[PDB]
Amino acid sequence: SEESQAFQRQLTALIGYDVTDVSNVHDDELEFTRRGLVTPRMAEVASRDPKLYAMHPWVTSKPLPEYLWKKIANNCIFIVIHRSTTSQTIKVSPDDTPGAILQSFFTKMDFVLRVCGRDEYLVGETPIKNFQWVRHCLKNGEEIHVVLDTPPDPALDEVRKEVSLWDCDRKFRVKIRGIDIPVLLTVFVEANIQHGQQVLCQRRTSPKPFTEEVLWNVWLEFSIKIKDLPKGALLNLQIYCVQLLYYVNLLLIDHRFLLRRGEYVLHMWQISGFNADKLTSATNPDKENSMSISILLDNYPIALPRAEMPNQLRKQLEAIIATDPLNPLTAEDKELLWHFRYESLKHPKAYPKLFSSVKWGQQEIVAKTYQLLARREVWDQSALDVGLTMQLLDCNFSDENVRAIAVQKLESLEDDDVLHYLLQLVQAVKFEPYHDSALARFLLKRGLRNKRIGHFLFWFLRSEIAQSRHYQQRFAVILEAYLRGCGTAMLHDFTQQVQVIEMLQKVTLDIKSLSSSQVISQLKQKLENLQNSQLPESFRVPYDPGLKAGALAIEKCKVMASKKKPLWLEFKCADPTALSNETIGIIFKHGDDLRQDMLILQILRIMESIWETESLDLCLLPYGCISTGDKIGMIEIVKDATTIAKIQQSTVGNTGAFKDEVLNHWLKEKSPTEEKFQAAVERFVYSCAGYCVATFVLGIGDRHNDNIMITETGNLFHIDFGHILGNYERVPFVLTPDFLFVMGTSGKKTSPHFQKFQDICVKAYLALRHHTNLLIILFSMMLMTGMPQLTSKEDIEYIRDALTVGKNEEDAKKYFLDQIEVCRDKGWTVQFNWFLHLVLG
Ligand SMILES: COc1ccc(NC(=O)c2cccc3c(N)nc(C)nc23)cn1
């Protein structure tokens, strides 16, 4: 058609990348994937309930926590129903199904129950105690306001209609024609055959003089038969001089199972100054500058098609299965897992170590490994272990079938859990040898089945497309596939949103250039222009899709006194049913890598989710944060909060003479009573401990005073995680004298609140250790995909020591309290030191 020719231009401006383009491709893999994705896309669209998909109920099957049960009067929950302007407060049992609440309105005295101010509906067949919003009200002690109205039209979601390799004993060989850098030592090419970070063979070239062009025309005969080549095997080409400068990759087996034959000119990636970018099958799009390599792949079509056990052996094997994800496997260890593979198969915990013990560079081994994969009764049966599942999806596993068993294990996750691991499952796509994968398709099904998962999948993919050339092509193909099945309704939200954000990033960047009262002029001025026939009436808040932002409260908007000039924007809620008049506060900033903040913030939600399994509430504040392009993005403004340094500058003022008594005063000054004050002390002890533990585990505990905030209600929380991770005497974390003074203690004393503090830190700390493997994998994955240059290895290893791996709960609990002591002993040294650094250099 033509309407479908104008449509591709819409998607391209939505994706932020032109997919259809073929200027930076050397094969039809991406086109092949775009085609391949059409089936799971249309398959999912066809299978989704149009009503339940339109109202996207935000449910959960996890048992309502203890803290929220101890927060109920008597199996009675009050809901406030609203219509015209007329209210009503009804009684509801925690098992009161939503639809049956209308037979408690047409019997107690057609339509659906929406929420006041939010695009959240209380539809579907679930007990009310199971709606996120309900659990959110109960947690923070609030009234449940519903605005009974007409269900959205499912018609609005409507989608726009549409020779065997095993026969050559021939040793693999590659011809290095040469390299050529269009601009400038000695130089040598390094050709590696890899599979799951495991190096099968290595070759080189004679060191030639580093000139603007270098030729060899040499054949590099590897010590690997053509038939011993596994799918997902990479030819890795690196240029040294001794330091590496470029590298580029080529899959020695394509998407069609054919051995790669032909002439290749690969525009190579440069090094700066391990991470995910080094694994890409994508070539550099920039040719005017990029180093190039020319190679030849012989072009003669070659396609790719139980007894007993001793006692000390079982014990050595058990000692292997037990060991954490980062403990390396010796040659002796691997040879053991392999020989006793059938016994190793009975333990799902053995799968990452057992599959790492596989000699992938050998045809016969892979075969026995697939024979091993067919007898998967135990794995397929056992309860889902995300931590174990995440391990098979990392950089260590290039095998299609191994990776697929992990994806099938994810298939059982409810939407609630996909949203917890979404960001990291999307980052895990970088570990996929191919563009089309079970994981790529899994993210597609999940995004298309649920609007919340789909809204977030959009921004996550969009973020990557804009700031990563190594993966934008692949990610762009997944986003396009998502957009062709989400519906024209959401396809409209995504458009309003992109329009709004791009207008605001322009304002961010421009104001950043004019660097004063003069700045306060332009900002407000530009915020008037965009507020005309350019910016639409409203838009969904990208970090809170249930919120619609209206007009810009121009009077409240401003530039912040930072090295960079982030906008402090404020919007009216664009929804009349809104039970309040409070604005929507967003910070727009360029200069810090917001992807790192997203990662940590997401790990924080997981730690909050871990603590829920043990009825604990450490009151964390993982505020909304969406990366939108390079250095640029937005941040949720936490309401009624100040930095700990500002509370100090308030009654000491830019000095460093940190008063141990200030904070506790500030709280009383803010407290409407002496009671809400105790709740503010109650919330403090919790939030403080929560961040104390979580910050320590992640190794971001030693923070700046300016980089820590508190709410006028006791809620403490760290910020700028992309500050330390983005460039970083010492301390575990931050348990300053002003904090301890709020906990009734002084110097080397004790009080009931502080004893409580330590008892919360012990419960919390140990509660995370029951999830060691999970946290290790997430931390490990995060550093490989989000903290570039900050990989080394000794960086990953940090988390092992923090979680005190191998230690008993008793060795651990002691370690933490002593970690707390480093604070009591340091007092203000650290803070005063950061002051001596962070404000005076
Ligand atoms: C490194 O990325 C960043 C950058 C800034 C921030 N936050 C702030 O600068 C910042 C400043 C003032 C108020 C707030 C606030 N109320 N809430 C939040 C999250 N951040 C704030 C968090 N992460």
Curated annotation (Swiss-Prot):
Main location, first listed in the record: cytoplasm
GO-annotated molecular function: 1-phosphatidylinositol-3-kinase activity; 1-phosphatidylinositol-4,5-bisphosphate 3-kinase activity; 1-phosphatidylinositol-4-phosphate 3-kinase activity; ATP binding; ephrin receptor binding; identical protein binding; protein kinase activity; protein serine kinase activity
Single GO cellular component term: phosphatidylinositol 3-kinase complex, class IA
Sites bearing Phosphothreonine, chain numbering: 772
Tissue: Pancreas, skeletal muscle, liver and heart.
Other known facts: Candidate target in therapy for inflammatory diseases. Selective inhibitors and protein ablation are anti-inflammatory in multiple disease models such as asthma, rheumatoid arthritis, allergy, systemic lupus erythematosus, airway inflammation, lung injury and pancreatitis.
Domain PI3K-RBD per the UniProt entry, residue ranges: 74-150
Localisation per UniProt entry: Cytoplasm; Cell membrane
First-level EC class: transferase
Subunit structure: Heterodimer of a catalytic subunit PIK3CG and a PIK3R5 or PIK3R6 regulatory subunit. Interacts with GRK2 through the PIK helical domain. Interaction with GRK2 is required for targeting to agonist-occupied receptor. Interacts with PDE3B; regulates PDE3B activity and thereby cAMP levels in cells. Interacts with TPM2. Interacts with EPHA8; regulates integrin-mediated cell adhesion to substrate. Interacts with HRAS; the interaction is required for membrane recruitment and beta-gamma G protein dimer-dependent activation of the PI3K gamma complex PIK3CG:PIK3R6.
Enzyme Commission (EC) number: 2.7.1.137, 2.7.1.153, 2.7.1.154, 2.7.11.1
Keyword tags: Angiogenesis, ATP-binding, Cell membrane, Chemotaxis, Cytoplasm, Disease variant, Endocytosis, Immunity, Inflammatory response, Kinase, Lipid metabolism, Membrane, Nucleotide-binding, Phosphoprotein, Serine/threonine-protein kinase, Transferase
Record entry for activity regulation: Activated by both the alpha and the beta-gamma G proteins following stimulation of G protein-coupled receptors (GPCRs). Activation by GPCRs is assisted by the regulatory subunits (PIK3R5 or PIK3R6) leading to the translocation from the cytosol to the plasma membrane and to kinase activation. Inhibited by AS-604850 and AS-605240.
Job description of the protein: Phosphoinositide-3-kinase (PI3K) that phosphorylates PtdIns(4,5)P2 (Phosphatidylinositol 4,5-bisphosphate) to generate phosphatidylinositol 3,4,5-trisphosphate (PIP3). PIP3 plays a key role by recruiting PH domain-containing proteins to the membrane, including AKT1 and PDPK1, activating signaling cascades involved in cell growth, survival, proliferation, motility and morphology. Links G-protein coupled receptor activation to PIP3 production. Involved in immune, inflammatory and allergic responses. Modulates leukocyte chemotaxis to inflammatory sites and in response to chemoattractant agents.
Catalytic activity line of the entry: a 1,2-diacyl-sn-glycero-3-phospho-(1D-myo-inositol) + ATP = a 1,2-diacyl-sn-glycero-3-phospho-(1D-myo-inositol-3-phosphate) + ADP + H(+); a 1,2-diacyl-sn-glycero-3-phospho-(1D-myo-inositol-4,5-bisphosphate) + ATP = a 1,2-diacyl-sn-glycero-3-phospho-(1D-myo-inositol-3,4,5-trisphosphate) + ADP + H(+); a 1,2-diacyl-sn-glycero-3-phospho-(1D-myo-inositol 4-phosphate) + ATP = a 1,2-diacyl-sn-glycero-3-phospho-(1D-myo-inositol-3,4-bisphosphate) + ADP + H(+); L-seryl-[protein] + ATP = O-phospho-L-seryl-[protein] + ADP + H(+)
UniProt-reported outcome of changing residue 703 to P: Abolishes protein and lipid kinase activity. Does not abolish interaction with GRK2
Origin organism lineage: Eukaryota, Metazoa, Chordata, Craniata, Vertebrata
Protein name: Phosphatidylinositol 4,5-bisphosphate 3-kinase catalytic subunit gamma isoform
Coiled-coil region: none
